[PDB]
């Protein structure tokens, strides 16, 4: 959640950073998925 706010500042002053933004959404999903389940 912090690391996607670290990269939320990288459009307020403004490719490759959306390859890590969309990478963050998979792993913000895969962390809340791994919080509830683990399999």
């Amino acid at each position: 959640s912090l690391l996607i706010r670290d990269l939320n500042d990288d459009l307020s002053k403004l490719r490759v950073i959306f390859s890590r933004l969309m990478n963050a959404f998979v792993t913000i999903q895969n962390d809340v998925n791994a919080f509830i389940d683990s399999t």
Binding site: M22, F25, V26, N30, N33
Partner: protein, 60 residues
Amino acid sequence: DGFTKIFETALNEKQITNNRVKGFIKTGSTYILSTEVKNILDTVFRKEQCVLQYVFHSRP
């Protein structure tokens, strides 16, 4: 896939020609971001409220 992603596979070129005959009256397997599933299913549940008021409730 294994409960992490949802894809929207490419509608083949036969069926866009079957769409545009009515609407006048992208790549292979594009990704679907999590917030745009909610913006679909919020508007569906607002419309089918009658049937989903009884799918989700077994007592009155």
